[PDB]
Design a protein around this ligand. Structure first.
Ligand SMILES: Nc1nc2c(ncn2[C@@H]2O[C@H](COP(=O)(O)OP(=O)(O)OP(=O)(O)O)[C@@H](O)[C@H]2O)c(=O)[nH]1
Ligand SMILES: Nc1nc2c(ncn2[C@@H]2O[C@H](COP(=O)(O)OP(=O)(O)O)[C@@H](O)[C@H]2O)c(=O)[nH]1
Ligand SMILES: [Mg+2]
Lengths: 315, 421, 428
């Protein structure tokens, strides 16, 4: 579609955040616009497509997002969503949630509900094969089974991955186990701060052929890492991780600006992700960018940097 | 501050033969390896290109590699064949016969382990590595075959070094072998992704330059390799000799690469004269001129992104930079709009021997999509017939890989048309 | 009563070749360090050697070896000639973070060593550029620690401003916006110099159509001698550099003056005109001798220093400073009635044996703060803005450790500087 789905969700307060008794800095108006204060003391406004506050239900943030997104995958086209944000409890509650209670699960099992809601809704040849691959140290790692290379196969734009392990599963808890199988082989880097720093841009692919003729549907779940600074990291190996993370984001940040200006040649081959994800962002597709955040006064410079990644120029 | 130099292919080893002939005379180094120059500046930066061995010996930082001995058989027997220590002559028999997969995908790759250890022991001897430097062609078997294979392992091993190479491009004039568009499209599948820069060079433009500028009758391979080697020293000697604006190759690299895939350049020597004035406005007009473009492209048909103007000699700065400014003033359409100053200067205090001044035009134009159109159109009609392809399919190459090579090449064409207007 | 001098970048180091070229000629000091037959910028040894209070640091090892193999290598102590091994590569991220971190710990101790050797430190003056890699990156990292450890000292910056038309690197506007954010927070008074006007003064008033970097820095070195090396000597009305910031900088962020120098003349034409103090002060306020390519008529003035040299009667200056308000085509703010600080040192202007400036008896250096500079910032901001619109060349920085939100962030603090220079003139 012509209008890019630029979103931002605010996480609620934690109990350890209430031990500090820190004041909130976020002001919710509606589902469209949410004012983000800044005390230094200039309250700024950041207008986006839709914004979710700290007191928002996990089905509710999904139904605005994942429920218009799902059917265009099966109706010919494909659709893509990203998950951009730093390490935080708001990041996990967006994707998988807690899961629990069949409604308060994240965007993934609410989709996995609505996938298997569609399997019982109408009856076609549902074949749900799924791969799950990361980008760790500029190579595409098979998180399911890494036993040498991940090879890309291209007649107009359709990119297939070789070396990935597509698993034809047909129950909701299956990929729920596979994501646990994904995290155990996913590379993390131990550190004094954020040791669980498993920082990798990571795709999660749901391709479902729904043939009768031939009918295909591909869904992509992008797990973007947060943009970091090498100075604030203070680490003497981690920098090669860090500078390749940020440079991959900006090339991804370049091509979306190359989309909205209706530029003739959108570049793709410069970064491996958008080369591996060419047609998913480019076509008559609907791209939802997600920025998670935690309120208070701690990650203020981390908060305002996400809004520059979320701000688009319009007529 | 040391650069590794490797020469591969029948082309590049001929080029590097005349190249080290120049640098030896640049410092008064004898063909044996003894210093007989008269300047400390000849003496100061020898380590950048040489290893000082005992008895004031100087072995060049140079590795010769091929699959056929015959070129190195001529070189080691010929002049400046004794300046090398004989360890560096890493080769074998059974040449590729201008087959890319023989040079890259198979046999030629078996020699690579013998090469990289000689690269390793040379790079271990460097106290501060600075970059790598290759000499090859695109349409050659033992030039492009190992030439892509060697740089792939090195950039994996040295992710921080500058990966420059001097690359001879196939012409619209000569088809020496007919498989020359097949070799180019496989190499560009590696050259975009594993180097930081390169230089596109046609034989045909050097045929034009020795004809219309040097007025020489029969331009032999000695003359053209003499001609391209002047820009090779023209790039690096500002880092070595003192200058006003001394600029690293990385200072070129951050100045000439606006987008991480566009790093192809059209070098050009400024004071090209026959034996029948010399100022900075004299130089820059020869820099601007399309006849001095050592690639077979019309740069006025293209548009420029960035221009590097390396200079050599005692020149007043305002005399350069105002004259540099006038180049953007006359044809402001020829440069891209989103870059306000499109040209970088660099002035070395020391000129080469004989001439009091020399400059070096290094440009990144949108004319290079034309030379990419020659290879892709030559790729298309040959791939339809699959004409003389069964050698490579017999060597283990898939048609999708060739299809993914040309589309990635076609990706590179679509950038320059996008940024031209 | 002493001050330190750091030189970084290829620019400010090569300027510092010309600065210490004057100070040895100021007192008959040889390149050795002794006078054949004053304790402000030197340290005298027991053997009569005088070591300068200068440290020369660069990432490139080229220009440092030009000093310690050419002349004046017997002058500086070799522990001061700090030398890197690999270039800055014209990257701010290299100089500010990536490369310069591994040298600055050696660098900061030498400043800490020399400040311990000093007593009564007036502060220090650094020498760099704006469009550089070492002289924008590393000097940004350098004045960070100095603002921490020496919070009470005067920090002076003789930066080279990126010229509008003549520029020597494509990434020069990309590094100026990064430099000014580090500059605006901690620098107390930073001078800019545009290279085009150094050409413009020399091709018209000095009649030299061949200027080199040597010929430019003799003018630049002559001004720095007029600010400091004269004013640490006796005069009729001496002014210290500590009272500068309260005389010249009216606000927190207005500390960007323009220096110039009026008696710039060739050897021949000084025989014609006997230079009085009246015509020299008018020659400071010429739009064509501003040393930074801006239109002073389009800018209001706030404050203006006039530092003098040689035989000068102050009674003539009071008539001459009244003459400027009599010749009022300048715009002056209604904030400040009397932005004219006079300072007259008794020392003459000195000649360099090889330069083309004649032996005048009197010399005037003029510092000034005008609102014409927002026009100058608007040029460099446009040059930035199109490159960030394309995300041009940014992968050499985010491939080195910067964030894309930061270049947007640093432009706003540059844009916040543009609000202030609009505010200071409009007020009534
Ligand atoms: N007046 C004068 N200016 C110079 C001189 N050398 C360089 N510059 C100016 O410095 C500006 C850019 O700063 P550079 O010193 O070149 O910065 P760089 O290219 O990164 O080199 P380094 O800072 O040493 O790493 C150029 O635009 C030049 O005009 C000099 O010797 N004299
Ligand atoms: N200038 C120059 N070019 C050469 C020379 N020898 C070969 N070439 C070029 O190299 C190309 C052939 O590549 P080549 O090196 O022979 O293939 P290889 O032997 O398999 O590596 C031809 O297009 C020639 O133009 C030479 O001595 N001088
Ligand atoms: Mg330099």
């Amino acid at each position: 579609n012509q209008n890019i789905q630029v979103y931002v969700r605010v996480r609620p307060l934690n109990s350890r955040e209430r031990c500090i008794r820190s004041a909130e800095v976020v002001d919710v108006v509606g589902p469209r616009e949410v004012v983000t204060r800044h005390t230094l003391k200039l309250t700024k406004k950041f207008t986006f497509d839709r914004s979710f506050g700290p007191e928002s239900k996990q089905c509710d943030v999904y139904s605005v997002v994942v429920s218009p997104l799902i059917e265009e995958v099966l109706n010919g086209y494909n659709c893509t969503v990203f998950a951009y944000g730093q390490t935080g409890t708001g990041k996990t509650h967006t994707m998988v949630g807690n899961w629990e209670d069949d409604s308060d699960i994240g965007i993934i099992p609410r989709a996995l509900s609505h996938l298997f809601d569609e399997l019982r809704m109408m009856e076609v040849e549902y074949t749900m094969r799924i791969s799950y691959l990361e980008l760790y140290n500029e190579e595409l790692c098979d998180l399911l089974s890494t036993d040498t290379k991940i090879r890309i196969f291209d007649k107009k734009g359709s990119v297939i991955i070789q070396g990935l392990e597509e698993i034809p599963v047909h129950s909701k808890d299956d990929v729920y186990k596979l994501l646990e199988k994904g995290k155990e082989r996913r590379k993390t880097a131990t550190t004094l701060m954020n040791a669980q720093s498993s920082r990798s841009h990571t795709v999660f692919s749901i391709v479902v052929h729904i043939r009768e003729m031939l009918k295909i549907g591909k869904l992509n779940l992008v797990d973007l890492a947060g943009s970091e600074n090498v100075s604030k990291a203070g680490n003497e190996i981690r920098v090669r991780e860090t500078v390749n993370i940020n440079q991959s984001l900006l090339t991804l940040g370049r091509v979306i600006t190359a989309l909205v200006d209706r530029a003739p040649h959108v570049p793709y081959r410069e970064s491996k992700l958008t080369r591996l994800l060419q047609e998913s962002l480019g076509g008559r597709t609907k791209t939802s960018i997600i920025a998670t955040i935690s309120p208070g006064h701690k990650d203020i410079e981390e908060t305002l940097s996400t809004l520059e990644y979320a701000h688009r120029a319009k007529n | 501050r040391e650069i590794v130099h490797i020469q591969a292919g029948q082309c590049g080893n001929q080029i590097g033969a005349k190249f080290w002939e120049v640098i030896s005379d640049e410092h008064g180094i004898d063909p044996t390896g003894s210093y007989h120059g008269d300047s400390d500046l000849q003496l100061e930066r020898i380590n950048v290109y040489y290893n000082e061995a005992a008895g004031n010996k100087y072995v060049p930082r140079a590795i010769l590699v091929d699959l056929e001995p015959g070129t190195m058989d001529s070189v080691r027997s010929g002049p400046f064949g004794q300046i090398f220590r004989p360890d560096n002559f890493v080769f074998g028999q059974s040449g590729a016969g201008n087959n890319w997969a023989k040079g890259h995908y198979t046999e030629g790759a078996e020699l690579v382990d013998s090469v990289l250890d000689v690269v390793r022991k040379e790079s271990e001897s460097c106290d501060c590595l600075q970059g790598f430097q290759l000499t090859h062609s695109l349409g050659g078997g033992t030039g492009s075959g190992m030439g892509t294979l060697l740089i792939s392992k090195i950039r994996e091993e040295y992710p921080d070094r500058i990966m420059n190479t001097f690359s001879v491009v196939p012409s619209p004039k000569v088809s020496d072998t007919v498989v020359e568009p097949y070799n180019a499209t496989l190499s560009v599948h590696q050259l975009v992704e594993n180097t930081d820069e390169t230089y596109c060079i046609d034989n045909e433009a050097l045929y034009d330059i020795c004809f219309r500028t040097l007025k020489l009758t029969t331009p032999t391979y000695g003359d053209l390799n003499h001609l391209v080697s002047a820009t090779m020293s023209g790039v690096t000697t500002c880092l070595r000799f003192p200058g006003q604006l001394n600029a690293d190759l990385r200072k070129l690299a951050v100045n000439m690469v606006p987008f991480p895939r566009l790093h192809f350049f059209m070098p050009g020597f400024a004071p090209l004269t026959s034996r029948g004035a010399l100022t900075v406005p004299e130089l820059t007009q020869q820099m601007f001129d399309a006849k001095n473009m050592m690639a077979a492209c019309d740069p006025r048909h293209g548009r420029y992104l960035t221009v590097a103007a390396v200079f050599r000699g005692r020149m007043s700065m305002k005399e350069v930079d105002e004259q540099m400014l006038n180049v953007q003033n006359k044809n402001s359409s020829y440069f891209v709009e989103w870059i306000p100053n499109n040209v970088k200067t660099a002035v070395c205090d020391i000129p080469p021997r004989g001439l009091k001044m020399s400059a070096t035009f290094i440009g990144n134009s949108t004319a290079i999509q034309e030379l990419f159109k020659r290879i892709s159109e030559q790729f298309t009609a040959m791939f339809r017939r699959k004409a003389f392809l069964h050698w490579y399919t017999g060597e283990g190459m898939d048609e999708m890989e060739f299809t993914e090579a040309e589309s990635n090449m076609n990706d590179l064409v679509s950038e320059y048309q996008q940024y031209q207007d | 009563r002493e001050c330190i001098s750091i030189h970084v970048g290829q620019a400010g180091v090569q300027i510092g070749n010309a600065c210490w070229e004057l100070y040895c000629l100021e007192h008959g000091i040889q390149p050795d360090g002794q006078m054949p037959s004053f304790n402000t910028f030197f340290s005298e040894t027991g053997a009569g050697k005088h070591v300068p209070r200068a440290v020369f640091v660069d990432l490139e090892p080229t220009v440092i070896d030009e000093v310690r193999t050419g002349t004046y290598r017997q002058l500086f102590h070799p522990e001061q000639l700090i030398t890197g091994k690999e270039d800055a590569a014209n990257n701010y991220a290299r100089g500010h973070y990536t490369i310069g971190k591994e040298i600055i710990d050696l660098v900061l101790d030498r400043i800490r060593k020399l400040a311990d050797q000093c007593t009564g430190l007036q502060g220090f003056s650094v020498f760099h550029s704006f469009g550089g890699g070492t002289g924008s990156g590393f000097t940004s990292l350098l004045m960070e620690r100095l603002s921490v450890d020496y919070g009470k000292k005067s920090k002076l910056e003789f930066s080279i401003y990126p010229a509008p038309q003549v520029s020597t690197a494509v990434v020069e506007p990309y590094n100026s916006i990064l430099t000014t954010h580090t500059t605006l927070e901690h620098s107390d008074c930073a001078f800019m110099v545009d290279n085009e006007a150094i050409y413009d003064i020399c091709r018209r008033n000095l009649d030299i159509e061949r200027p080199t970097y040597t010929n430019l820095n003799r003018l630049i070195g002559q001004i720095v001698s007029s600010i400091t090396a004269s004013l640490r000597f006796d005069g009729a009305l001496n002014v210290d550099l500590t009272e500068f910031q309260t005389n010249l900088v009216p606000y927190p962020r207005a500390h960007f003056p323009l220096a110039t120098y009026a008696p710039v003349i060739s050897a021949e034409k000084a025989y014609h005109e006997q230079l009085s103090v009246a015509e020299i002060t008018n020659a400071c306020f010429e739009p064509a001798n501003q040393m930074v390519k801006c239109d002073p008529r389009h800018g209001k003035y706030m404050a203006c220093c006039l530092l003098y040299r040689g035989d000068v009667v102050p009674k003539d200056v009071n008539a001459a400073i009244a003459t400027i308000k009599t010749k009022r085509t300048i715009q002056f703010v209604d904030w400040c009635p009397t932005g004219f600080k006079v300072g007259i040192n008794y020392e003459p202007p000195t000649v360099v044996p090889g330069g083309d400036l004649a032996k005048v008896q009197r010399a005037v250096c003029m510092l000034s703060n005008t609102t014409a500079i927002a026009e100058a910032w608007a040029r460099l901001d446009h040059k930035f803005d199109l490159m960030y619109a394309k995300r041009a060349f940014v992968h050499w920085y985010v491939g080195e450790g910067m964030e894309e939100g930061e270049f947007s962030e640093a432009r706003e603090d540059m844009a916040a500087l543009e609000k202030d220079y609009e505010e200071v003139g409009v007020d009534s």
